[PDB]
Amino acid sequence: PGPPGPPGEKGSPGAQGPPGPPGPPG
Amino acid sequence: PPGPPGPPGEKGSPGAQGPPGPPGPPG
Amino acid sequence: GPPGPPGEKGSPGAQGPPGPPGPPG
Numbered sequence: 001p002g003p004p005g006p007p008g009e010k011g012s013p014g015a016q017g018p019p020g021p022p023g024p025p026g
Numbered sequence: 027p028p029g030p031p032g033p034p035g036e037k038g039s040p041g042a043q044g045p046p047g048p049p050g051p052p053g
Numbered sequence: 054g055p056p057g058p059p060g061e062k063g064s065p066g067a068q069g070p071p072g073p074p075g076p077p078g
Contacts, residue, residue, distance in 0.1 A: 001029055002057030008035030011066035016073075017044035023078035026053030029054030038063030047072030 001055040003028065003031050004057045005032030005034050005060035007060045008063030009037045010063050011038030012040045013066045014041030014069035015043045016069045016071075018046050018072045020047035020072055020075035021049045022075045023050030024052045025078050027054065029056045032057030033059045035060030036062045039065045041066030042068040044069035044071050048074045050075030051077045053078035
């Protein structure tokens with residue numbers, strides 16, 4: 001047969017995680 | 027002879043979402 | 054000949070970065 005095709009593109013980068021919780025009272 | 031090269035591979039899976047950020051500072 | 058088979062699946066994307074710090078308390 002023909003040779004295999006080229007490797008696929010790298011996946012999309014993941015989104016940044018959510019903001020952290022509000023800090024404690026001071 | 028051999029045929030032409032195959033089609034491109036599938037795009038990779040998306041990366042995971044990052045973790046939650048740190049707790050904020052004290053008031 | 055038959056055309057070649059598809060290429061291998063791409064690598065996964067990188068995990069996203071950690072989130073921003075939360076607001077002050």
